[PDB]
Amino acid sequence: CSASSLLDKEAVYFCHLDIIW
């Protein structure tokens, strides 16, 4: 079920990454 409900959590937070860095 969405990898313990992560998948989007990790993709979104890390790609958001504070305005690309």
Side-chain angles (χ1 to χ4, degrees), residues 2-19:
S2 186
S4 180
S5 189
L6 274 60
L7 192 294
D8 63 287
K9 187 78 67 168
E10 187 289 300
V12 172
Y13 288 14
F14 184 84
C15 71
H16 201 80
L17 308 180
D18 190 352
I19 314 182

